[PDB]
Each structure stands twice: as structure tokens, then as C-alpha cells.
Curated annotation (Swiss-Prot):
Keywords: Acetylation, Activator, Antiviral defense, ATP-binding, Cytoplasm, DNA-binding, Exonuclease, Helicase, Host-virus interaction, Hydrolase, Immunity, Innate immunity, Isopeptide bond, Mitochondrion, mRNA processing, Nuclease, Nucleotide-binding, Nucleus, Phosphoprotein, RNA-binding, Transcription, Transcription regulation, tRNA processing, Ubl conjugation. The keyword Glycoprotein does not apply. Residues 310-458 are annotated as: Necessary for interaction with HNRNPK. This is ATP-dependent RNA helicase DDX1. GO terms for biological process: defense response to virus; double-strand break repair; innate immune response; positive regulation of canonical NF-kappaB signal transduction; positive regulation of myeloid dendritic cell cytokine production; protein localization to cytoplasmic stress granule; regulation of translational initiation; response to exogenous dsRNA. Residues 278-458 form the Helicase C-terminal domain. The keyword tRNA processing applies.
Length: 458
């Protein structure tokens, strides 16, 4: 009953009104969202229609508008944008009801829609209004004629933001945010709410980036404090690898006995081209982003070792404290004491990069890193999340970069008793060997399928 909203820090007089409209318990989205919204932080709610988003903000807006009048006009304190006459009215009928048992003082609400005379709406405006619900058109109309004051708005809400963007109102939203001051007279910071029926939507992500301040995402996972992007590594459309000869990364020598010279026109050639390009692409990314810090995930112990040596060739290594390509490695063939020291040197900010394998990273605990680079994608799709999980403090968006080949790459598996040490059997697992044909595009597809979405490409 009304207990279920009171518990979350809702004013009892509001909670009572909510029980009386047959909202007896909160939706999962309301259960999570309201505490956050009362907390004053910016909140992006992403969940299907009918999950209770609109209600999640209808309830606590009244509280927040009330606690700002109790502390201090005629300028509205909260503006809610809806893409519908329909949705504006239901959203207004909610605010009407939940404000029922609030006196000392009462709260003045106003609809703002096409059809109803401005003279009705402007009588209401000149007088004293606290809470505005309306549609982009008249809201744009009535603000850009000097009618509707937004100076003291501390609670902005873009409901059905997906629809609002696809209805072409991005320009509007961005104007409204520029106009509303970022700090209130109270000294407090503008609270922005974004509701979406769609998740993973790029347009809503770009909107969260542009008009929200370190928002909390809410869904009924990808820690969306995280940008992540695929750089395809296509040795057919990038022919850089032909024009180096032997000024490149030391590859894994799976193709030592193979002809990988141009003209070979074999899968073995395209595979060695990839192994060469991943080198160049790793260096370029680090240069372009000017990365202060990153974790770098290689598939194997010697993949790590070979990248450390190439980083050395770039003025870096474990002996160049602070340099752009300063780094340490963390894997099996590293004595366990060297690991502990290598790891503290990374936490100290001695070296910029921590090069490690999935298996070594089980051992590590570390988060809040601004960059991860996946040189190669993980065998198990589950590990993409674990890997990406290590980027992005709440006060700094991280970035995962994944270098994904567009052809199959022959790599080492190793079935031999030696567990790698001294084996060079280039033949396939199938034919008694310690190599397989990796298919990184397929892994990506299984990964994108697991996250039930699409990852941006560059
Ligand atoms: N706690 C609740 N208990 C019962 N019904 C609720 C509750 N919250 C919302 N509803 C109702 O469920 C429907 C969906 O609510 P709404 O907030 O509009 O969802 P959304 O904005 O996610 O589409 C509405 O008819 C609303 O009145
Ligand atoms: Mg709604
Ligand atoms: Zn082997």
C-alpha cells in the first residue's frame, strides 16, 4: 500500500494519493528510479511501454517542486515534455492526483498543447505556475515569443525521447537545455530525466551525452557508463601491411614456414596481414586518443610479450615511467612475484598500459579505467562483458576499442603435453597440430547477439 512508496522516501501525503489511484506497489522501474530521482542525480529510464516510467517521475516531481517552494516567483520549477496531446493529458492527470494532499503551499500545474487558446494558457502563465506539461510545438512557440519563463526550472524531463528525436525535436531539446541555467539560485544543479521505450538507441545515447550530467541508467548487462567500438581490421581494404616489409610488430610466427609475401593470395597471407595491422592499429589508437591509462587484452602470453616489445620500439616499455607507450605484462610465463609488482606499478600510474590475458585478469581486480583495447576478441562471449566491465568511473565515461579482423586468422591453440614450451607444430588441431582457424567476425556476432544489439564501427 502507501507504505511501499513512503519506504522509498516519498512524502506520505503523496504516497496516500498514489494508493488512492490504485497504484498499490511500485513497478520494478519505479522501485529503482524514484530513490535516484529523489537523490537529485540525472536519470535515464530505458524500458518497454507500460513498465511505469512516466509514473516514476510523476510521483517524485511533486515532492521536489514542493521542497523548493518550502525553502524559498511565478516561474515554473519543473518542465515535462511529451510527444502527444494524449501523453501530455495522462501525464497531467497523474500530477493533478498525486499533488491532491499537499497544502502550505498548494502547487499550480498547467497543460500547454495545440488546440486550446493561448489566452487560456497565458492567463494561467502571467499569474503563477510551478509545474508545466506540454508538447514541443507550443512549448517552442510560447518560449520563443518571450511568454514561457525557464530561468528557475530545476527539473527537466524529456518523456518518450526516442519518439521526440525521431519526431525531429532534437534542435528544440538542445535550445531548452542551453536556456535553462545549469545551476539554480539554491546553488543546486539542474536535474534532467530522459525516458525511452528503446534501449541501446544511438540517438538517445548522444542526447544523454549532450544534455545529462553522469546520468544513472535504469533497465528492467552493458554498464552504459561505457562507450565501446569495433575497428574492423580488413587487410583487403587497408594495404598498409604490404608497405612496411619488416618495420612491423613481431607476429606469433604461426606463418614462419608460410609464404605471406604479397602475391601469395592465400588465407595464410591474409592472416599474417591481420597480425601485422593489429600492431599498427594498436599504436595509432593509443596515439589518437592520447590514452593516460588502459588495460590491453591479448589472446596469448606471447601476444602480450610481442606487443610490449613493439611498445618498446615506440619509446615505451616497462622502463620508460610515464611515456605514451609505458607498459607492463601480466600472464602465466611471468613469475608470480613480478606480476604483483607489475600490477602495483600500473595502479601507481608508473606505466600507462597493463597488457594481460583473460586468464591473468581473473586474478586482477581493477575498475574505473578510461580505456580498454581488445587486440583479439575472447573465445567465450561472456568475457567481453567482464573485459568492458573494467572501464568507466561514474565521473568519466570509459571506452573499449576492439580490433576485429574481417578474415579468418590462423592462431596457436596447443594440445601438446609441453603446454606451449618448445612446440611449433603449425598443423591444425584436426590434423594433429597446435593451431586453429579463428573467426573473429563470428565471435563479434555471438557477442552482439548476447547483448541483443549492435556495436558502433570505425
Ligand atoms: N505502481 C503502479 N501500480 C499500478 N498501475 C500502475 C502503476 N504505475 C503505473 N501504473 C499504470 O500502468 C500504466 C503504465 O504506466 P506509465 O507510467 O504510463 O508507464 P510507461 O511510462 O512506462 O509507459 C498506466 O496506465 C499507469 O497508470
Ligand atoms: Mg509514458
Ligand atoms: Zn603445441
Amino acid at each position: 500500500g502507501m507504505a511501499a512508496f513512503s519506504e522509498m522516501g516519498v512524502m506520505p501525503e503523496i504516497a496516500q494519493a498514489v494508493e488512492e489511484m490504485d497504484w498499490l506497489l511500485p513497478t520494478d522501474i519505479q522501485a529503482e528510479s524514484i530513490p535516484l530521482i529523489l537523490g537529485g542525480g540525472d536519470v535515464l529510464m530505458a524500458a518497454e511501454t507500460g513498465s511505469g516510467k512516466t509514473g516514476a517521475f510523476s510521483i517524485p516531481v511533486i515532492q521536489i517542486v514542493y521542497e523548493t517552494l518550502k525553502d524559498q516567483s511565478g516561474a515554473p520549477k519543473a518542465l515535462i515534455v511529451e510527444p502527444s496531446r494524449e501523453l501530455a493529458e495522462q501525464t497531467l492527470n497523474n500530477i493533478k492526483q498525486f499533488k491532491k494532499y499537499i497544502d502550505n503551499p498548494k502547487l499550480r500545474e498547467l497543460l500547454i498543447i495545440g488546440g486550446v487558446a493561448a489566452r487560456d494558457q497565458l492567463s494561467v502563465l502571467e499569474n503563477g505556475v510551478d509545474i508545466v506539461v506540454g508538447t514541443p510545438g507550443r512549448l517552442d512557440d510560447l518560449v520563443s515569443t518571450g511568454k514561457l519563463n525557464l530561468s528557475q526550472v530545476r527539473f527537466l524531463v524529456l518523456d518518450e525521447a526516442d519518439g521526440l528525436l525521431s519526431q525531429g525535436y532534437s534542435d528544440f531539446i538542445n535550445r531548452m537545455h542551453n536556456q535553462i541555467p545549469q545551476v539554480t539560485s539554491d546553488g543546486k544543479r539542474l536535474q534532467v530525466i530522459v525516458c525511452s521505450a528503446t534501449l541501446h538507441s544511438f540517438d538517445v545515447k548522444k542526447l544523454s551525452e549532450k544534455i545529462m550530467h553522469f546520468p544513472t541508467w535504469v533497465d528492467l548487462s552493458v554498464p552504459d557508463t561505457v562507450h565501446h567500438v569495433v575497428v574492423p581490421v580488413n587487410p583487403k581494404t587497408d594495404r598498409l601491411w604490404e608497405r612496411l616489409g619488416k618495420s612491423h610488430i613481431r607476429t606469433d610466427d604461426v606463418h614462419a614456414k608460410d609464404n605471406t609475401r604479397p602475391g601469395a593470395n592465400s588465407p595464410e597471407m591474409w592472416s599474417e596481414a591481420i597480425k601485422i595491422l593489429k600492431g599498427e592499429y594498436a599504436v595509432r589508437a593509443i596515439k589518437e586518443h592520447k590514452m593516460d591509462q588502459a588495460i590491453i587484452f591479448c589472446r596469448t602470453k606471447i601476444d602480450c610479450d610481442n606487443l610490449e616489445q613493439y611498445f618498446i620500439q615506440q619509446g615505451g616499455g616497462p622502463d620508460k615511467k610515464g611515456h605514451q607507450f609505458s607498459c607492463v605484462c601480466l600472464h602465466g610465463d611471468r613469475k608470480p612475484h613480478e606480476r604483483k609488482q607489475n600490477l602495483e606499478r600500473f595502479k601507481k600510474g608508473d606505466v600507462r598500459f597493463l597488457i594481460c590475458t583473460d586468464v591473468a585478469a581473473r586474478g586482477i581486480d581493477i575498475h574505473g579505467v578510461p580505456y580498454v583495447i581488445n587486440v583479439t576478441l575472447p573465445d567465450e562471449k561472456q568475457n567481453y562483458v567482464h573485459r568492458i566491465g573494467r572501464v568507466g568511473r561514474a565521473e568519466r565515461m570509459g571506452l573499449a576499442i576492439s580490433l576485429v579482423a574481417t578474415e579468418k586468422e590462423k592462431v596457436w591453440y596447443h594440445v601438446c603435453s609441453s603446454r606451449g614450451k618448445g612446440c611449433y607444430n603449425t598443423r591444425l588441431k584436426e590434423d594433429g597440430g597446435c593451431t586453429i582457424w579463428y573467426n573473429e567476425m563470428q565471435l563479434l556476432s555471438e557477442i552482439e547477439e548476447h547483448l541483443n544489439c549492435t556495436i558502433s564501427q570505425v
